[PDB]
């Protein structure tokens, strides 16, 4: 019963800021939002320290309302609430003189409550409730500034793709209702152990769950909705790309780890899709001339990393990368938001450069972030990415090509992160920034974000050093394990990864200080800026043809109604022929009369 | 008892039609709402307020009434919807009396415990709708009226021979549903009787080939859309199917089930898809109602008590929020002067709470979890997947086009750059919005409490399709 308050607080707060909202001073809505996030973080950490929580209430027959708070659920809850409080403070800072303070922080509270509903669920229908709520809050916050059409169609496309993924989710859930009839993840796992049945249908349900997870975490093909979230304010982009709305993809697999652990083909496919998503997000990252896009594509790349980890069966490793990423990407985004608040929303890369000396603590934030993304040898991003690299080989399904693939993707993440940092802070000066570059309450939670990004790190370290995260994650869920391991050679691999990451950092440094950009690289950068022409083909054969088919069906319905009219007119015509049967000549009437009478007398036999 | 709640909207609508004033009809619809709610609460069961009175002793027709778990919440649903249409209407043409009359008629229809009285109310509800269509607006009013009315009548009149066969060929003494179900029909006669039932019940559902009346009906009514809301409450096809058609002649439904599921799937998809191509509110909502009715029909036709309860719940709630969207479109017409979707884009900044209200309503429409649609939608998905997974999947290529058309309309009406500026809200519109959002939130968060009367009826009439 007390567990419900964690969700209720940034729902009552959302209701206040939505309904009255503007009856308050400017800081007060953000203050209330951040305070509810804080006094929900605290009261949920108390429950986690009390061993766990359970809640069951009456709902749809056979589908009750079941909340389970365990190790795996609490890990996600603490991540989301902490980063949400930090981004709430950063949004109190970043939002100023902008109407709809109430709307913004009510939407923030709503987002927090919906993400909590998602992660705290013992039933797949409650998981789906949280899913659609997060999608709605994302649409709302991306379309917060409605006076611009650009920042509305973005959210529209986002939610449409999201509802595609949610329909796949629903179909998988109908499968895992027709099959078992529980739809409560706990009893569904306990019913799925042992003699599995209809393996084709089970793999199909798992595949549909993964299809939903792809739409949510912006994997291929449904990736395209994530970059346009730049339309949303920068703290919104931070919360969406780092702590929420994407992590749910990995969480669904980790909770369904019992389901996917017995689906080798499905887990292999998940690994393949994660690899391809990382490769794309990395290749199309640096060509982007906007900081928001060049960071969003890195988000896509790192989410591909996490999905590869969870696909090879390395669930706790995927969660490790989720942790490190939620730190350093929030760092990146809030740094970028402070940058564009200093330049008055310039939000460009080629219009940037030489912000090193002029910006105090922002060069430090952005550098810590870029190094965590590139995998600095002693940094959380390094530990997570390389734990993924190791779990590739150690965990089942072979990981042979996946290892070299993820290594090249790490090279590219280093290169484009260095392109980001170079082109933003170094090697020319352009524009204007007079008064105020660094604000207090934006960089203050960003300070803690840089701190956490640096020191997330060593919670999961190769087995001589303590792997604290794995024993925490394994017992609550992701129970089934089959992983080999090695020593001496594994640390040689760690050394190879660290050296390669350093080489990629300096390679990006030189290549993107260069500005030479030889013939082929210009084409490559342009292609990466245009996201490799994906939307062009999506609207060529899919979206616009669906529109034309909608119009065609409308015209077909019109013609159907016209045919109904034609039938009525045929009846009328018959009627007027029968009225023409009466000419008005008495001889005609009498002949027709005698005719009808003889017809009757014949019928009588 | 039941009959009092049934008759209260009728007498109030008469007192608005002939008597004065317009304002009294609002509180009359409210009193109907309260009594229907009171009957909904403390409800012991179907028999709750049983009523049996002599009507045609010789022929065997009696007034038979009572609140099932189905009749109770349908009473409450209709009372609420028509009360909103009474307060917010702004039509005030003195045909709010016609609206209240149609409300009472729908209440009696749902309270009908015998087949012939059910049939009588089903045919009687035509007159108010046709009037509030004809004399209170529309230029193609006469042709839309002829289309809708002639469709309903060509479907209905053979169902009289079907009910006569259902009573006579089974040796049923009366038209009471109890007796009629106590005397089931045999093969190749229940076939023809169920066919005669299914014609009218599909054309009133509506299904794909038979929906051509829905856009003409919805367009030419009074632009406020009170007539449109009451016509959407007139989509009882699913209720009739579940309560009468299938239980009375399941043998024909056994063969026709594949076809019916397919039609429901295609109706849902086609409606949700063409609604995107719709350029006006009336047509958009018409195709949306078509899609929802398709989903409900799918849920009922799947057998599957899950799907059946989902279809019935989705029916009641879709009537509710579709009538709400109709009244909202009518009020925006009264303040602006146009129902076009493209023009007058700046609304969001000018309209403080109309944006939030329309958003809540469209989200409830697209079947978002937490609002009224999703429980029925999901139960229907489950049952349809049980019956025919292929047709379930086809029918559920609907959420996409639903979100598409809903978000497109909402954005292009409200979000974009400010225009002149629009009137904010009326005092009656305030209560309309509050109560609408309250009902939507309650039916979305607690589908357990509601439909508790629906679960036994669903499982029983689905197991009736077994041995």
UniProtKB/Swiss-Prot annotation, chain A:
MF annotations from Gene Ontology: NADH dehydrogenase (ubiquinone) activity; quinone binding
* Cited InterPro entries: NADHpl_OxRdtase_5_subgr, ND/Mrp_TM, NU5C-like, Proton_antipo_N
What are the EC numbers?
A: 7.1.1.-
Q: Name a Pfam family for this protein.
A: Proton_antipo_N
Q: Name one GO biological process term.
A: ATP synthesis coupled electron transport
Q: What is its main location?
A: membrane
Q: Which reaction does it catalyse?
A: a quinone + NADH + 5 H(+)(in) = a quinol + NAD(+) + 4 H(+)(out)
Where is this protein localized, as stated in its record? Answer: Cell inner membrane
- How does this protein lie in the membrane? Multi-pass membrane protein
TM spans, by residue?
1-21, 29-49, 75-95, 104-124, 126-146, 165-185, 206-226, 234-254, 266-286, 303-323, 325-345, 364-384, 397-417, 441-461, 492-512, 584-604
A GO CC term assigned to this protein in UniProt: plasma membrane
In UniProt terms, what function does this protein have?
NDH-1 shuttles electrons from NADH, via FMN and iron-sulfur (Fe-S) centers, to quinones in the respiratory chain. The immediate electron acceptor for the enzyme in this species is menaquinone. Couples the redox reaction to proton translocation (for every two electrons transferred, four hydrogen ions are translocated across the cytoplasmic membrane), and thus conserves the redox energy in a proton gradient required for the synthesis of ATP.
The family classification in the record reads: Belongs to the complex I subunit 5 family.
Give the PANTHER family listed for this entry.
NADH-UBIQUINONE OXIDOREDUCTASE CHAIN 5
Quaternary structure (record):
NDH-1 is composed of 15 different subunits, Nqo1 to Nqo15. The complex has a L-shaped structure, with the hydrophobic arm (subunits Nqo7, Nqo8 and Nqo10 to Nqo14) embedded in the membrane and the hydrophilic peripheral arm (subunits Nqo1 to Nqo6, Nqo9 and Nqo15) protruding into the bacterial cytoplasm. The hydrophilic domain contains all the redox centers.
Q: What is this protein called?
A: NADH-quinone oxidoreductase subunit 12
Gene that encodes the chain: nqo12
From Swiss-Prot, chain B:
Output the GO biological process annotations, alphabetical, semicolon-separated: ATP synthesis coupled electron transport; electron transport coupled proton transport
Q: Where found?
A: Cell inner membrane
What membrane topology does the UniProt entry give? Answer: Multi-pass membrane protein
Gene Ontology CC entries for this record: plasma membrane
Q: Where, by residue number, does the polypeptide cross the bilayer?
A: 1-21, 23-43, 47-67, 69-89, 91-111, 115-135, 144-164, 190-210, 258-278, 284-304, 308-328, 354-374, 390-410, 430-450
Q: What is its EC number?
A: 7.1.1.-
Give the signal peptide range: none
Keyword Lyase: yes or no?
Answer: no
User: Is Zinc-finger set as a keyword in this record?
Assistant: no
* InterPro entries in the record: NADH_Q_OxRdtase_chainM/4, NADH_UbQ_OxRdtase, ND/Mrp_TM
Q: What class of enzyme is it?
A: translocase
What's in the keyword line of the UniProt record? Answer: Cell inner membrane, Cell membrane, Membrane, NAD, Quinone, Translocase, Transmembrane, Transmembrane helix
Chief localization: membrane
Q: Catalytic activity annotated for this protein? A: a quinone + NADH + 5 H(+)(in) = a quinol + NAD(+) + 4 H(+)(out)
In alphabetical order, the GO MF annotations are:
NADH dehydrogenase (ubiquinone) activity; ubiquinone binding
User: What function does the entry list?
Assistant: NDH-1 shuttles electrons from NADH, via FMN and iron-sulfur (Fe-S) centers, to quinones in the respiratory chain. The immediate electron acceptor for the enzyme in this species is menaquinone. Couples the redox reaction to proton translocation (for every two electrons transferred, four hydrogen ions are translocated across the cytoplasmic membrane), and thus conserves the redox energy in a proton gradient required for the synthesis of ATP.
The entry's family comment says: Belongs to the complex I subunit 4 family.
Subunit structure, interactors included: NDH-1 is composed of 15 different subunits, Nqo1 to Nqo15. The complex has a L-shaped structure, with the hydrophobic arm (subunits Nqo7, Nqo8 and Nqo10 to Nqo14) embedded in the membrane and the hydrophilic peripheral arm (subunits Nqo1 to Nqo6, Nqo9 and Nqo15) protruding into the bacterial cytoplasm. The hydrophilic domain contains all the redox centers.
Tell me what this protein is called.
Answer: NADH-quinone oxidoreductase subunit 13
Which organism is the protein's source?
Answer: Thermus thermophilus (strain ATCC 27634 / DSM 579 / HB8)
